[PDB]
Swiss-Prot record, chains A, B:
EC number, as in UniProt: 1.18.6.1
Gene it is expressed from: nifH1
Family under the similarity heading: Belongs to the NifH/BchL/ChlL family.
Coiled coil: none
SUPFAM superfamilies per the UniProt record, alphabetical: P-loop containing nucleoside triphosphate hydrolases
PANTHER family linked: LIGHT-INDEPENDENT PROTOCHLOROPHYLLIDE REDUCTASE IRON-SULFUR ATP-BINDING PROTEIN
Record-given protein name: Nitrogenase iron protein 1
Cofactor(s) the protein requires to work: [4Fe-4S] cluster
Classification of source organism: Bacteria, Pseudomonadati, Pseudomonadota, Gammaproteobacteria, Pseudomonadales
Length: 271, 271
């Protein structure tokens, strides 16, 4: 039945290209998906939708100044492989925060009925923490699986450890676990091992090493996924291996976060 | 006894210069104050402290990697007129959010005992919303008074209305009210009237019109308040009138926020 997954990690490492390309690889093997963009910089769906940008719930709300007065097809549009896309996030142009804009958006979706029967997966592309307004895409009637995108960079890994402290310190004993660490490459054979090393430190797995290949940037300036743009590329089979691993994955763990002294040790040992 | 006030409003309108200059005008008439910077861009105390920047609780924490292992005089320093200064805010350099960094900071302060007997005023320089982690400086054992700094600018006023919706929708019936609207000038005699017009719409008062005068920028590049730098300036008596009005103010109201249709009407009518 409908698994609910959520992709956390920091910005600037390509987390949203990985999310779309995995979602496209899932669409392609028969799965029915919805992407829900819980990102202030709302951009998690342009590669599935071939969009300049997708209009958000928190921008079609203040626009029409609502309480309970917007529709589903005004915000949930379909794209590659029949994947359904929602944006939320940003107050932009208005003021405030975007974390609350996630709650006044997936609530719209629940009450609007977008979580229908044959949906296999719902993906939440959220951010740097598992707290309050950005932990909402992970509570009781929500995400039971969390995958962290990181890389062999100090800040990226420190965000992967801090997102993990938020998964253990979640508002009492519901079920939201850690599925794995997806790694978005930057260098050769001792970066995958560093993320495997952090994975084993926190009690998870590096569920896939996404290589750095040029087909990816060539697909995203042309507004597509590598699965759509070049289905025959080697990288295209990276997102299929990631997808099959996500589908079939059973290790959902409660992570054991490390000290920034321990993480200093790991980064000293690598670079 | 110790009144707890909190200054909200948007960024870029000079809210933090007004806060320091009012706090200095209060120091000067005998009052004992503490400024507590609950701002991500932690800069609410450089004019009282004559500081390049003040080291934050959420920067002396990760630095010394703490749980319960930092001291008070490592973060609370005194400045003009004996005003006591604290910074908190930012994760900077680390990742995450700064809203939670306000809770893991005034909690430090309570447990550390900075709210001593002869403190007349505690001021919280916070931001754009009265929600969760930035509403914490306003709950039960905290701020009972809220002053919003704004101006005759679309976004500034829209933030003053939205901070007001957060004061009415606060987590049940404790006491945190709206003290008034401080206006930081930009133009002549129909801007003070516009903020008076919004004040009366929400059921408060424009408690003071802070004029635009050059002595202010000349005092802040020299890292002081106008009360310290030129006590004899006309603007120096603006912050004294504001200060006496804050001391003596009794209208603490539960605001009645307007629609963005009503605020469109007010801005059409002015500019
Ligand atoms: S808080 S409007 Fe950790 Fe968002
Ligand atoms: S939420 S770590 Fe309206 Fe902050």
């Amino acid at each position: 039945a409908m698994r609910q997954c959520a992709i956390y990690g920091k910005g600037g490492i390509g987390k949203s290209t990985t999310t779309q390309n995995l979602v496209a690889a899932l669409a392609e093997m028969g799965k029915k998906v919805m992407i829900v963009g819980c990102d202030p910089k709302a951009d998690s769906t342009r590669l599935i939708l071939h969009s300049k940008a997708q209009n958000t719930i928190m921008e079609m709300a203040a626009e029409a100044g609502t309480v309970e007065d917007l529709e589903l097809e005004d915000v949930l549009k379909a794209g590659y492989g029949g994947v359904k896309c929602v944006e939320s996030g940003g107050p932009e142009p208005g003021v405030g925060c975007a974390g609350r804009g996630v709650i006044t958006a997936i609530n719209f979706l629940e009450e609007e009925g977008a979580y229908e029967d044959d949906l296999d997966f719902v993906f939440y592309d959220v951010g740097d923490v598992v707290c309050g307004g950005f932990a909402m895409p992970i509570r009781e009637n929500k995400a039971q699986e969390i995958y962290i995108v990181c890389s062999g960079e100090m800040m990226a890994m420190y965000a992967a450890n801090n997102i993990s402290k938020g998964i253990v310190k979640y508002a009492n004993s519901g079920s939201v676990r850690l599925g794995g660490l997806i790694c978005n490459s930057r260098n050769t054979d001792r970066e995958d091992e560093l993320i495997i090393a952090l994975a084993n430190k926190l009690g998870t797995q590096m569920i896939h090493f996404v290589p750095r290949d040029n087909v990816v940037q060539r697909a995203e300036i042309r507004r597509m996924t590598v699965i759509e743009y070049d289905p025959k590329a080697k990288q295209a089979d990276e997102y299929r291996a990631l997808a099959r691993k996500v589908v079939d994955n059973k290790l959902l763990v409660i992570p054991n976060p490390i000290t920034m002294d321990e993480l200093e040790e790991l980064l000293m040992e690598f670079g």
